Design a protein around this nucleic acid. Sequence first.
DNA 1: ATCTGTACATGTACAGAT
DNA 2: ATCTGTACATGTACAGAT
DNA 3: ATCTGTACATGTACAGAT
DNA 4: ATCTGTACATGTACAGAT
Lengths: 348, 356
Amino acid sequence: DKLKKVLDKLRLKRKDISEAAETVNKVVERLLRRMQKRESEFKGVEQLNTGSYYEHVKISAPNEFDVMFKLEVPRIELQEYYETGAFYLVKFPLSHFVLSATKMLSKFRKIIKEEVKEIKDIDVSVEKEKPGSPAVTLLIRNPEEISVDIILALESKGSWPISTKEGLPIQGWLGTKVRTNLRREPFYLVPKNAKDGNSFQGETWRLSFSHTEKYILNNHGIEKTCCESSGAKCCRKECLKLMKYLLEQLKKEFQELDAFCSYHVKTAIFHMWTQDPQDSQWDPRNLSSCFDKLLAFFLECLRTEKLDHYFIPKFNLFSQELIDRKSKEFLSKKIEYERNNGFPIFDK
Amino acid sequence: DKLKKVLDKLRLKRKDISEAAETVNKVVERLLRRMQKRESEFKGVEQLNTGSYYEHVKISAPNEFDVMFKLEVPRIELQEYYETGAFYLVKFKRINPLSHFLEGEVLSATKMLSKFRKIIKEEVKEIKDIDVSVEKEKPGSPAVTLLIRNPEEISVDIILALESKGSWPISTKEGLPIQGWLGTKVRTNLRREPFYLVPKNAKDGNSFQGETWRLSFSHTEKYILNNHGIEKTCCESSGAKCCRKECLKLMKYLLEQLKKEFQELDAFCSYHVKTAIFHMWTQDPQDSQWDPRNLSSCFDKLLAFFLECLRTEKLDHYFIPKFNLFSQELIDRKSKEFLSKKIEYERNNGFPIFDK
DNA sequence: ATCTGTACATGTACAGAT
DNA sequence: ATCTGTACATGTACAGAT
DNA sequence: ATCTGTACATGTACAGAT
DNA sequence: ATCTGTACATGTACAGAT
Ligand SMILES: Nc1ncnc2c1ncn2[C@H]1C[C@H](O)[C@@H](COP(=O)(O)OP(=O)(O)OP(=O)(O)O)O1
Ligand SMILES: Nc1ncnc2c1ncn2[C@H]1C[C@H](O)[C@@H](COP(=O)(O)OP(=O)(O)OP(=O)(O)O)O1
Ligand SMILES: [Mg+2]
Ligand SMILES: [Mg+2]
Ligand SMILES: [Zn+2]
Ligand SMILES: [Zn+2]
């Protein structure tokens, strides 16, 4: 009854979805046109929508949209940066860019920013660039505030990089056929736009599997009929929404939680879904246990400082390198706290 | 245990699989290549392997292969033949290498199949590598059948097909009722795939005899047989084994053995058993109603279901609901009651026909 | 010199074999 | 329980053509 | 090569029935 | 309270035409 009532609150309204979509769609379609019918280095860029709005796990409002502009590049040689798993250098139109991530992002951003100056019917500007974000972010204003991330991506049609050989461990959940077919899809690369000063900073790209993640979110049962009109509904997505909301609310309240992001929750629940594959373990009537064993799984990840990338097993999103220890026990007490008092933060 | 051992007899041997595939593939590759040559009307034809050997339900010996030579035919218009659901006239809206088979707008099936057949015959003459002849044409069959004598005997049905990429013909709207078993996304995807038309090729002196085509969904049946569980891991190396294909194999064998002894059964064919089990799989969607430890019971309910279809004279095509393969129009009641008796007799007496 | 239908190259599920 | 031939889907190369 | 048209998935919203 | 059935809305895949 409690968690159900929070999910009613988190539910997007049909009207809000329509108003945001037609304005987001107007901007994106025009932006896509410039990079094409104009003689840019990005002629051939194709649009692939990603993230929580398109996975139907957006909460609260339709105010954040993520779009990948992906560009096929033939026979690129990858070269893994210092064994990290997820970061690579790229080698062999694009001549003006070893292919520089920053050099290519800047021209892309230049093109976007120019075309936004020519938009006269929508209140839209280009947010100032952020370190560590490969996106060019639009800030739109219907009366309400909407944010669009335009992510630049390379598309390689080759065998996936060796670092993912043990990745995507869906074999007992979605199976070997699904896994083999998914690994036949392209894979993508996006700028590592960190501004730390470390060595190969400006030429490093990151592996992206947002297209695989979207398929999983929408094909998430061991039974083919899970959540379909002739199957049984499960509560896998509601748990992800609840865990996203609890992290959102904690991040509003505490600046110490700044190094956490919803992707950490997304990754943790891919692992849960793999360890509890049966749809009956995500039955709607057990929403509380499910949310709770998700909380405990997430605290075990904090306590051991271990949360491996679902596709890149050796890449630990929870290493000392990315999140100082103390940041983690801060989140652990805060989370054990909400847990052991019936989630007060959910009433605000 | 009794049925486990039948399956052991029925299992194909890798050695045989090997010697038979090496030959069969040689011939088919050579026939396909000749269809791309010169000013061939069939240039562009593409190969699709179908049937029980590629579904992995071929029993006893790998001695019968089925292959589809399908030709994409755009800008195509269908006239259902007399409300039968399965049979169609094919018309074109433009005036094409197929023109030599047109009869003002209407695409002649027997003319096309005849030209196809003459080419296979001519290319088989040039094969001096293996003992292989073209079997005398069989009425009702769209196939061109090769008999290969690699010591052992081997049949290959080369089926000629039109490939259309449009949405499926409305007589299938209510077909393929897999929503509760493989689900709606699977169904939507399957129905985006092409559909196929093969020559009906009967010689019954009925109107439009030589211009009637028949819907075929062999490619969809291939997908279903190799993706047959409600659970995605069914029969996979990290999932649980089921006995769905093992029931099919036992049913096919019972029919095969009886058909081998009793001429009364000429009207029957493995497609009848294959259809019945598609319905049984829809009736019982859960993989747990096909546990391997339940083989004798699973096989038994499939037999009961088949007897009911026989007795009530109703076995609806899985894809075309209004097309009844057990109508009086296609099989005498005496044919059906005869098979009913033999099935009931096998069932209530230890399946003595398995030991033959 | 560049283009492209044909076919080799690669990876793996399925299932027989040891 | 692992090793292994066939089938099949998709990436890529290049002799022969433009 | 680009774009429209079609089909049905995923949602939200709400009355009527359990 | 929840389940079921209809209406309403967007997202996405791809056939066919221009
Ligand atoms: N593949 C990734 N690797 C690292 N960080 C990521 C990745 N994907 C997303 N993030 C981070 C970026 C942002 O800080 C945060 C949310 O970004 P976003 O792309 O909008 O995700 P999302 O759409 O799945 O969830 P949300 O509901 O928060 O919008 O997650
Ligand atoms: N769609 C169909 N409609 C009518 N009869 C069919 C159909 N498909 C096959 N048949 C008939 C043709 C043969 O007489 C019999 C088996 O044909 P075939 O294509 O070899 O089937 P199969 O490969 O699935 O089974 P088998 O193991 O007996 O070869 O069924
Ligand atoms: Mg989002
Ligand atoms: Mg066969
Ligand atoms: Zn579900
Ligand atoms: Zn199975």
